[PDB]
Amino acid sequence: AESTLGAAAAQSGRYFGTAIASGKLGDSAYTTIASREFNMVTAENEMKIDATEPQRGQFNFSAGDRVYNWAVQNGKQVRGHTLAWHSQQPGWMQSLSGSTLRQAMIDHINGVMGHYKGKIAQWDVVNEAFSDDGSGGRRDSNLQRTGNDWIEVAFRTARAADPAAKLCYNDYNIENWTWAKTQGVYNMVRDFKQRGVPIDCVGFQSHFNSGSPYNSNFRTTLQNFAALGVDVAITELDIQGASSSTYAAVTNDCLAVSRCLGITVWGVRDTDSWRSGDTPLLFNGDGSKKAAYTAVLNALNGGSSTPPPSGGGQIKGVGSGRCLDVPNASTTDGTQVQLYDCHSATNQQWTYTDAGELRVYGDKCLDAAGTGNGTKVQIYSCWGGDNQKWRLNSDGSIVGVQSGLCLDAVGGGTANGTLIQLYSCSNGSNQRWTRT
Amino acid sequence: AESTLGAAAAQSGRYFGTAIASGKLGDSAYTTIASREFNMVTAENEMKIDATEPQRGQFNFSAGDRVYNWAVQNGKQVRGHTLAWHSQQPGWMQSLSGSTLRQAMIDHINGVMGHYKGKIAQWDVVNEAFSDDGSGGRRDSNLQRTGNDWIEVAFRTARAADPAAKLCYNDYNIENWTWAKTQGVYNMVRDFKQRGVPIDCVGFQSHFNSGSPYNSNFRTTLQNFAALGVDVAITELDIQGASSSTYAAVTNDCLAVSRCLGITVWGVRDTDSWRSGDTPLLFNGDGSKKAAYTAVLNALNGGSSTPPPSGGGQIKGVGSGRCLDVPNASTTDGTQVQLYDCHSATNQQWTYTDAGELRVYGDKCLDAAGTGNGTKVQIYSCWGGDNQKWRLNSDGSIVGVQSGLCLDAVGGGTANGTLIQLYSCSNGSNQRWTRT
Numbered sequence: 047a048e049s050t051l052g053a054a055a056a057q058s059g060r061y062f063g064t065a066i067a068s069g070k071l072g073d074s075a076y077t078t079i080a081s082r083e084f085n086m087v088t089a090e091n092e093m094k095i096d097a098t099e100p101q102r103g104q105f106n107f108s109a110g111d112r113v114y115n116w117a118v119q120n121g122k123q124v125r126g127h128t129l130a131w132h133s134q135q136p137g138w139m140q141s142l143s144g145s146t147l148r149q150a151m152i153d154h155i156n157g158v159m160g161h162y163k164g165k166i167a168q169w170d171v172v173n174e175a176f177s178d179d180g181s182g183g184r185r186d187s188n189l190q191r192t193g194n195d196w197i198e199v200a201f202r203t204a205r206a207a208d209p210a211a212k213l214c215y216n217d218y219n220i221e222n223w224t225w226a227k228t229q230g231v232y233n234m235v236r237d238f239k240q241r242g243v244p245i246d247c248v249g250f251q252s253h254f255n256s257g258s259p260y261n262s263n264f265r266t267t268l269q270n271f272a273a274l275g276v277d278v279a280i281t282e283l284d285i286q287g288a289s290s291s292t293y294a295a296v297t298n299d300c301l302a303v304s305r306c307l308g309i310t311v312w313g314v315r316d317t318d319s320w321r322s323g324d325t326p327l328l329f330n331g332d333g334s335k336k337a338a339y340t341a342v343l344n345a346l347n348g349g350s351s352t353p354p355p356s357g358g359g360q361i362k363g364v365g366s367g368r369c370l371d372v373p374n375a376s377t378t379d380g381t382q383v384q385l386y387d388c389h390s391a392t393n394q395q396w397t398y399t400d401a402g403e404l405r406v407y408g409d410k411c412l413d414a415a416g417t418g419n420g421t422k423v424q425i426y427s428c429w430g431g432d433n434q435k436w437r438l439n440s441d442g443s444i445v446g447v448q449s450g451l452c453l454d455a456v457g458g459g460t461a462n463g464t465l466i467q468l469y470s471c472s473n474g475s476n477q478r479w480t481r482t
Numbered sequence: 483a484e485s486t487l488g489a490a491a492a493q494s495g496r497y498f499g500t501a502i503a504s505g506k507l508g509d510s511a512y513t514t515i516a517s518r519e520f521n522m523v524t525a526e527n528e529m530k531i532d533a534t535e536p537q538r539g540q541f542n543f544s545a546g547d548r549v550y551n552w553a554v555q556n557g558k559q560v561r562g563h564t565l566a567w568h569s570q571q572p573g574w575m576q577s578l579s580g581s582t583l584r585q586a587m588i589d590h591i592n593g594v595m596g597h598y599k600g601k602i603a604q605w606d607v608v609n610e611a612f613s614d615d616g617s618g619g620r621r622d623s624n625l626q627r628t629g630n631d632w633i634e635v636a637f638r639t640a641r642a643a644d645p646a647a648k649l650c651y652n653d654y655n656i657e658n659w660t661w662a663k664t665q666g667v668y669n670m671v672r673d674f675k676q677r678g679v680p681i682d683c684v685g686f687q688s689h690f691n692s693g694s695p696y697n698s699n700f701r702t703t704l705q706n707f708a709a710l711g712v713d714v715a716i717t718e719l720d721i722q723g724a725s726s727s728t729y730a731a732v733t734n735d736c737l738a739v740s741r742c743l744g745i746t747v748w749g750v751r752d753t754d755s756w757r758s759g760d761t762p763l764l765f766n767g768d769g770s771k772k773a774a775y776t777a778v779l780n781a782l783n784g785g786s787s788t789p790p791p792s793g794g795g796q797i798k799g800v801g802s803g804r805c806l807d808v809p810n811a812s813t814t815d816g817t818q819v820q821l822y823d824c825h826s827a828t829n830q831q832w833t834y835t836d837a838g839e840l841r842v843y844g845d846k847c848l849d850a851a852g853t854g855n856g857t858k859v860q861i862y863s864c865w866g867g868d869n870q871k872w873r874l875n876s877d878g879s880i881v882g883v884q885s886g887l888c889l890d891a892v893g894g895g896t897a898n899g900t901l902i903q904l905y906s907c908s909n910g911s912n913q914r915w916t917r918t
């Protein structure tokens with residue numbers, strides 16, 4: 047299909063998944079969205095070391111299976127996460143070092159993979175093994191201290207435990223090619239392939255923020271790794287601010303690399319995010335689609351053959367030919383917008399921001415004074431409210447994030463002065479627009 | 483004094499207050515801000531009818547006195563809120579009608595005012611007695627059904643009860659001079675003054691949002707009421723989104739009217755707000771000052787000497803004489819800003835938005851990648867994080883809302899290429915800027 051992320055991704059032979067939290071499965075709003083939009087599931091925490099082996103030699107899959115069972119019942123494949131990692135290790139493992147730890151690591155891999163044998167698409171065998179100090183070397187952890195060959199051992203162990211699973215090395219801050227960490231991981235994967243160490247994929251967490259911003263060279267990074275003869279996957283995608291452009295850019299990078307298996311965003315709603323403060327996901331707390339959601343979907347569907355305007359630009363309604371206009375170039379908050387003959391003027395220059403706003407005059411925002419039909423569409427000081435965020439559908443309609451309603455020309459009017467309101471989307475020509 | 487809102491307001495014989503919730507007086511973070519910034523207090527709930535007369539004839543002033551005492555002890559006057567109101571009436575009063583209710587209203591007024599006789603600066607004697615249907619008439623309530631003269635009776639009773647208190651009529655949606663409701667209240671007060679009804683002030687709640695946006699004619703409203711021979715007061719100010727320009731506009735509206743006694747914002751921090759989702763106050767939940775705070779303080783202190791930049795402008799470092807410049811006009815997220823000979827170029831044109839952002843290229847924001855000294859100041863997609871919010875202090879320093887740190891030209895460098903970082907504010911020339 048082309049209406050849901052999963053189905054859209056499938057159109058390029060890829061999947062689109064999310065991270066599922068078992069404690070949220072009782073939330074109808076949560077499951078409704080999760081089941082509908084994704085065809086791949088990763089347990090956010092239920093398959094980690096502490097959750098699967100709370101005591102040494104004592105495995106527990108109750109939490110993991112709650113996620114797993116839900117995924118299969120809803121037709122989703124599953125990414126196992128994660129088998130060997132310095133973080134979230136149960137206390138009994140944090141106390142280990144040397145050979146004792148090495149064998150515990152091997153035992154854990156066997157126990158967890160054995161339970162899920164033949165049921166997992168991808169396994170993040172080893173997670174975050176490289177340093178984040180900026181050097182490019184191995185992270186100093188109890189695991190790394192058992193010997194530099196611990197990662198290799200983890201992978202060989204995993205291959206034997208379940209030959210049907212794709213074995214991935216997963217890490218963050220390895221998306222920017224210029225970063226030393228990225229290159230350190232490349233060198234390790236290269237070495238592995240050259241010596242025959244079992245490894246089928248590299249997972250790029252993709253936790254983008256102003257500290258580790260997404261960069262266009264992410265595509266070369268993916269290509270570079272793909273060339274090593276391994277698949278690549280965006281595993282824990284979230285973008286601080288959820289820029290619609292960045293989300294589409296990341297999506298297109300993956301679609302540009304044939305080895306990119308798919309994209310998993312780390313969570314369903316911003317409120318479910320481990321970093322909700324950065325509102326980095328595709329759905330907001332209300333369960334409504336954010337501006338970025340539409341951008342990702344449109345990208346998955348191939349995008350549009352109409353390059354979106356770069357800075358400023360009028361918004362012409364197909365049904366009237368006239369442009370979205372602010373009555374007499376007013377700058378008064380609460381001024382309802384109207385349809386007026388297009389012409390070079392600031393009160394007709396609208397900039398669609400990455401946050402989903404339709405700005406005018408530079409700091410005034412298309413604002414909805416309500417969520418129901420007939421709601422007055424006006425201009426108001428930009429503050430980021432969902433009643434100020436809009437989704438630009440490929441069918442030309444402009445939907446309000448908070449209301450889920452379309453920009454509608456009152457009474458279908460097409461003459462100058464016709465006011466703009468919100469109203470259930472109808473596909474009508476008085477609700478379709480074009481950028482110029 | 484001029485480093486706190488209260489002190490800055492006192493310079494013109496005015497006050498800057500807030501609404502105090504007695505339960506929060508036990509929280510240090512709350513009281514630290516409240517006791518420091520305001521010189522006027524309104525009990526958010528402690529002095530309402532239900533809270534003061536749970537049962538007819540049985541008055542309970544415990545909660546009210548606790549707020550009152552805290553106020554006076556910390557150098558703040560008090561606004562009594564509120565004596566006659568259709569809403570939030572005790573269960574017993576709600577069931578009353580006709581003359582029985584009329585007597586109840588009168589008795590309540592005498593009881594509460596008698597208790598606080600001579601200690602209340604202003605009393606919201608009657609509250610929200612007008613309708614929002616557009617008729618400009620009285621809202622139909624049990625109080626109004628007692629007789630249209632109930633408001634007048636309320637005020638006459640109040641005057642006799644305590645001659646030292648200024649008697650105000652308080653309401654919302656009476657800020658926009660063109661609204662029917664506003665005219666309704668205007669005519670009533672005009673009639674009252676002409677007939678000698680004892681009323682000394684009109685309180686404008688000033689709850690501004692998309693539904694009831696702030697309009698510059700608010701000053702006209704205040705002036706008009708002022709011309710009636712009554713004082714005016716902004717009693718419950720909060721602005722959806724806390725627009726800096728709107729907060730500054732309301733402030734200047736009061737400063738422009740000699741009869742405007744002062745401004746009270748409805749809450750301390752956004753998390754204390756009855757409308758927290760609209761983050762409509764001057765302080766963030768973590769207690770940090772928002773861009774709007776600095777806008778209000780600068781306005782109260784008499785503003786700058788030269789009219790502030792009307793969007794789009796250079797930011798020049800005092801010590802260097804050079805401008806904030808994005809290297810090579812790059813638009814790549816993560817690019818660190820620098821100092822450079824000032825010239826006409828978009829990569830040197832910054833726009834300070836109402837949200838407190840410093841935008842460039844229209845949709846890129848001055849961004850801090852961290853909160854500690856040495857943090858890199860760069861450009862990043864605009865999304866609204868506090869790490870993208872800035873306060874333009876009167877001394878020329880620019881402080882990050884999240885970090886509390888100042889924009890700093892690294893090492894006090896003055897040459898082209900000098901990088902910009904965050905650093906503890908020092909009043910150094912490499913931390914002072916002018917927008918011209």
Ligand SMILES: O[C@@H]1[C@@H](O)[C@H](O)OC[C@H]1O
Pocket residue numbers: 090091320
């Ligand atoms: O919930 C968090 C999870 O999302 C993150 O991946 O790892 C740490 C957990 O606390």
Ligand SMILES: O[C@@H]1[C@@H](O)[C@H](O)OC[C@H]1O
Pocket residue numbers: 371372373374375376386391393
């Ligand atoms: O905003 C409109 C303006 O653009 C047009 O030129 O004249 C009519 C106004 O309402």
Ligand SMILES: O[C@@H]1[C@@H](O)[C@H](O)OC[C@H]1O
Pocket residue numbers: 454455456457458459469472474476
């Ligand atoms: O313009 C609106 C039209 O698009 C809708 O179909 O019916 C209501 C009208 O006001």
Ligand SMILES: O[C@@H]1[C@@H](O)[C@H](O)OC[C@H]1O
Pocket residue numbers: 614615616617660661662663
């Ligand atoms: O009278 C008011 C009207 O002027 C305004 O436009 O909408 C609200 C009404 O109450």
Ligand SMILES: O[C@@H]1[C@@H](O)[C@H](O)OC[C@H]1O
Pocket residue numbers: 807808809810811822827829
């Ligand atoms: O950004 C700078 C640009 O404004 C100047 O013109 O040339 C040098 C660049 O670094």
Ligand SMILES: O[C@@H]1[C@@H](O)[C@H](O)OC[C@H]1O
Pocket residue numbers: 890891892893894905908910912
């Ligand atoms: O720029 C900084 C300067 O302002 C401070 O005084 O010393 C450290 C420098 O990095």
